[PDB]
Amino acid sequence: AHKSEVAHRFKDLGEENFKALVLIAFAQYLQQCPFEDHVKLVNEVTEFAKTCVADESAENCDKSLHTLFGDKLCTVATLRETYGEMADCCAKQEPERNECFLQHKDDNPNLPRLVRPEVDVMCTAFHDNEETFLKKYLYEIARRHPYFYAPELLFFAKRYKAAFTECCQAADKAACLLPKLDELRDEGKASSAKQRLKCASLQKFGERAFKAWAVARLSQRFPKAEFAEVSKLVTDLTKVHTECCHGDLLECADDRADLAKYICENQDSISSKLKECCEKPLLEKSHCIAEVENDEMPADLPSLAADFVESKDVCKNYAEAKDVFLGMFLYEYARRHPDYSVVLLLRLAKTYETTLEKCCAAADPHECYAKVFDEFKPLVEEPQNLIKQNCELFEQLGEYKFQNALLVRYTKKVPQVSTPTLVEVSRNLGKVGSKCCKHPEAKRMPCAEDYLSVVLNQLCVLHEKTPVSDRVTKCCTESLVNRRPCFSALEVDETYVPKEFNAETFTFHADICTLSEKERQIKKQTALVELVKHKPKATKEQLKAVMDDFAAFVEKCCKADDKETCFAEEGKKLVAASQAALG
């Protein structure tokens, strides 16, 4: 396989893992081409690989995968028809050609939404046409998420299969399945957004900013590891994110294996918990190490007060290699705080920095910087107090009513954002409450950071494409440490011009009674926002009193025969009282 990289990779990867990545890849570059067309390209390329395994001497096996992929893209007939100047790439050398192709990938393709089929239909297809069933999904998921790291999407497509295995052969397949599909969807939609943010935050902020976030996260993960070790990994980890964001998966995947290789050797130098993962095969090893549990910190926890306070060379050591010192601070503090959000640990370091800038210029440095660890406690409480205020509320209200609290809350704060956005974001923010309040107190803040980050990012992408607010924009275009407290610090818009009434917005029909919870709930939540938009000035009590009356209205007309007249004639009456109530 010296001659042929193809064969080299068709052996490092399964045929099954290969065929899927080739499919993923082609979708990701050629988003508009049909499935049938692609599975044709897949098989042409697969048959070609095998040939090279047998004889690496076979013609066109010697070629680099870069050259072979491009050659196979330019094979496509509708390349000039559908993809225009993407076809012009095909006239260039393979350095410029591949880079050309990457530049034409649509960050947001305009493809219809994927409408989930009824379980019965799906399960039938899972049985009768499994491969076809499972490959379209990778296709549909990939066309829509072109920059998504193909190997991650390979792990997602197999957890998918395990749900049809489990939920299809069950009494109630629907009630079983759709919460596992919405679950994976949610985990997959998160992972997509996490990859954008990671790549975005590398360019929109410093490599320093990324290296710092990295120090802190890896110091929690591997607490029993020297600054020098941690430091080295931060470097290699940056190298890999900088490359994977360039977009070349081949080098990206290679670097990862190499890094994982380094990690799996030297494992006693890094962490205990890396054994499981380190056994795993190529693509998976890297995947697992990213997710490995935070290793236990050494029993001996030397006071960080001794080194960074209550010492003389604090200001000396800082003067030379301050970013080593700051880094050393952050490392030391990070491993002694795996329950802290990373955006917090960084905030603390920007403090220690900010402090030592002032206090080293000071006449008495020792007495100047003696209360730095007291400047951290307000910063630890703010995110902790919002964790408890919010998880308190959640338990009382349950997920739906929690969501509805958030809807009313945010609609007043930013009434300009479309009802659909507000509804999605609030729903999703509910799931953060569900996901993370089930985590114990320690583990709560990391959890929040992960999910908020994506929810907040997705929001911050959507909005900026179609801006409606100054205050959302300031927060999105702001530091990663300061992005969340910026949103938290939002207040109600007192300048809003209440929306006009429209009865159809508050009309309702019998369907709702038998509808699915999700789609029923969303119907009601649209109304809630629309209500709050139309009457922002209204009290909790006032809105509750309506919500109580709307509730009973449904409970009634869904226990009615000829519900349709009920809904119309009680909806006329409900609407009228409501206007009276809030008018």
Ligand SMILES: CCCCCCCCCCCCCC(=O)O
């Ligand atoms: C509104 C979502 C409900 C779930 C709990 C949210 C709590 C927000 C505060 C915690 C933020 C942690 C990240 C950070 O340290 O900035």
Ligand SMILES: CCCCCCCCCCCCCC(=O)O
């Ligand atoms: C347009 C949607 C705005 C969503 C705001 C997300 C805020 C995330 C942090 C939660 C902090 C508590 C709620 C708040 O007061 O903002």
Ligand SMILES: CCCCCCCCCCCCCC(=O)O
């Ligand atoms: C003032 C204009 C007419 C308003 C009509 C009532 C709309 C309220 C719908 C809110 C949904 C409540 C949530 C629920 O009960 O699950």
Ligand SMILES: [Co+2]
């Ligand atoms: Co060979």
Ligand SMILES: [Co+2]
């Ligand atoms: Co190899």
Ligand SMILES: [Co+2]
């Ligand atoms: Co059968």
Ligand SMILES: [Co+2]
């Ligand atoms: Co998506």
Ligand SMILES: [Co+2]
């Ligand atoms: Co390359």
Ligand SMILES: [Co+2]
């Ligand atoms: Co390289």
Ligand SMILES: [Co+2]
């Ligand atoms: Co002292």
Ligand SMILES: [Co+2]
């Ligand atoms: Co967790």
Ligand SMILES: [Co+2]
């Ligand atoms: Co303003």
